[PDB]
Write a protein that binds this ligand. Structure first.
Ligand SMILES: [Fe+3]
Ligand SMILES: [Fe+3]
Ligand SMILES: [O-]
Length: 477
């Protein structure tokens, strides 16, 4: 019923409500310019959140995405919640940011916010080559949710950061993925997402960085941010499912053709129009290593500071069996010293980036293990693996050297001769591009990917998840 749906009593804060209503047309102009291409008249079968009530939170129906009901939804407030780590452990959580942390928390929220529209901008062309209505609908669902995450951060900026907050909300729509004068902040969000295989890896791997960053902020002493991220985690889960099941369905299809043709010869697989498993492995290597750089330098005074001040906790902070202060704790990280990769212990507070990275690696591996059930049930030997964490890194201690996927420091000549086996080549990408082509007949799936296990919201897999309204009704006519 509400114009800006929310469970935050927005209408009782009239100054804030005015400011968000003032900002909304510019969000909608951004959505129209940079959102899913040519989609202004589509009716999409979308889920929309209307609460955080884990039973009846999200309801489905057709909507044109310009009319999507983007809302602000915080996890329920908890009475007498305490801060759980850092200097301030045991004190009451903050409803407003302490002045001394204000600009730091602001930059953290803006940086998180910036990735949300960035992903929409990267993915805006994908619809033209959607391999199915089911997949097109999933893409759009991810898009409108990422749009909501921008709302979720812009709300915090306006509600808790005054004028600076408003100015950040405006600049969040002035930056643009890949733009020369005003690029998005983070490299991985500034690059192209050129085809559906990249899109599925991105939502499987890079949205998972979102998951771990958000789980760290879900711990924050700044409780409105903590409550915001806590609810976004439940949405991020859907994104991770799109990416994991997306790739799982490509692997499934490729294995079907391997069994049918009785061969694992790449040339024969490609003649049949599937993506050979070794090439899938390269895309995994590419997105995994690129995403890894997002956690930042292994050793960081800044990250020590976020923890100590109560701004950002460790993943699942409350399950960790230590003092949650870490003045006298250690953490084991790698190091490179000439022609050797070694391990060393450093003060735990200085290595929080690396700890979060390690948590993400573990989570990604759990998903790859699930992928591996597929070749295994076909009786194939192929297994997907993650490359050594030092492989293909632009950030941190491995940035000045080459590491092979199996964890050796290698020479410039070996990198130059071998990396074509490890990362997608121009020729691999051209091949994958040649498979990309829309498939919009109900219940039909492009030949490079298998059908999903089930539909959406109990609908058949052949349901018309998107109705294009190809006819162009005339103004006032
Ligand atoms: Fe997001
Ligand atoms: Fe996401
Ligand atoms: O997300």
């Amino acid at each position: 019923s509400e114009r800006i749906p929310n469970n935050v009593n927005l209408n009782e804060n009239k100054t804030l409500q005015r400011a968000l209503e003032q900002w909304q047309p510019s969000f909608l102009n951004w959505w129209d310019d940079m959102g899913p291409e040519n989609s202004s008249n589509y009716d999409v079968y979308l889920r929309t959140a209307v609460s955080v009530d884990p039973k009846g939170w999200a309801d489905f129906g057709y909507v044109k995405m310009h009319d999507y009901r983007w809302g602000i939804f915080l996890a329920p407030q908890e009475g007498e919640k305490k801060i759980t780590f850092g200097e301030h452990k045991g004190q009451d959580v903050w409803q407003e940011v302490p002045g001394e942390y204000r600009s730091t928390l602001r930059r953290i929220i803006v940086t998180q916010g910036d990735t949300e529209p960035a992903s929409v901008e990267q993915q805006r062309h994908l619809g033209l080559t959607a391999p199915s209505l089911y997949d097109l609908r999933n893409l759009f669902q991810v898009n409108v949710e990422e749009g909501r995450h921008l709302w979720a951060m812009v709300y915090l900026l306006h509600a808790h950061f005054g004028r600076d907050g408003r100015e950040e909300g405006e600049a969040l729509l002035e930056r643009r993925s890949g733009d020369e004068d005003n690029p998005r902040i983070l490299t991985a969000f500034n690059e192209k997402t050129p085809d559906w295989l990249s899109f599925f890896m991105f939502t499987f791997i890079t949205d998972r960085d979102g998951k771990f960053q958000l789980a760290s902020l879900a711990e924050s002493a700044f409780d409105p941010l903590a409550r915001t991220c806590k609810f976004m985690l439940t949405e991020e889960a859907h994104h991770l499912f799109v990416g994991e099941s997306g790739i799982a369905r490509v692997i499934q299809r490729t294995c079907e053709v391997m069994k049918e043709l009785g061969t694992d010869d790449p040339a024969k697989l490609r003649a049949a129009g599937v993506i050979d498993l070794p090439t899938l492995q390269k895309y995994l290597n590419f997105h995994y290593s690129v995403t890894s750089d997002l956690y930042g330098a292994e050793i960081s005074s800044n990250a020590a500071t976020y923890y100590t001040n109560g701004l950002k906790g460790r993943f699942e902070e409350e399950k960790i069996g230590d003092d949650h202060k870490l003045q006298n704790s250690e953490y084991e990280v790698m190091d490179v010293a000439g022609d050797k990769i070694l391990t060393r212990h450093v003060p735990a507070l200085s290595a929080l980036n690396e700890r979060l990275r390690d948590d993400w690696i573990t989570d990604v591996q759990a998903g790859v293990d699930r992928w591996n059930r597929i070749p295994a049930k076909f009786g194939f030997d192929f297994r997907f693996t993650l490359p050594h964490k030092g492989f293909h890194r632009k950030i941190g201690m491995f940035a000045d050297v080459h590491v092979s996927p199996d964890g050796r420091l290698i020479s410039e000549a070996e990198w130059t001769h071998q990396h074509k086996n490890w990362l997608p080549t121009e020729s691999d990408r051209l091949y994958v591009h040649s498979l990309m082509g829309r498939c919009l007949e109900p219940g039909k799936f492009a030949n490079w990917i298998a059908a999903p296990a089930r539909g959406i919201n109990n609908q058949p897999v052949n349901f018309e998840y998107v109705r294009f309204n190809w006819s162009h009704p005339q103004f006032e006519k």
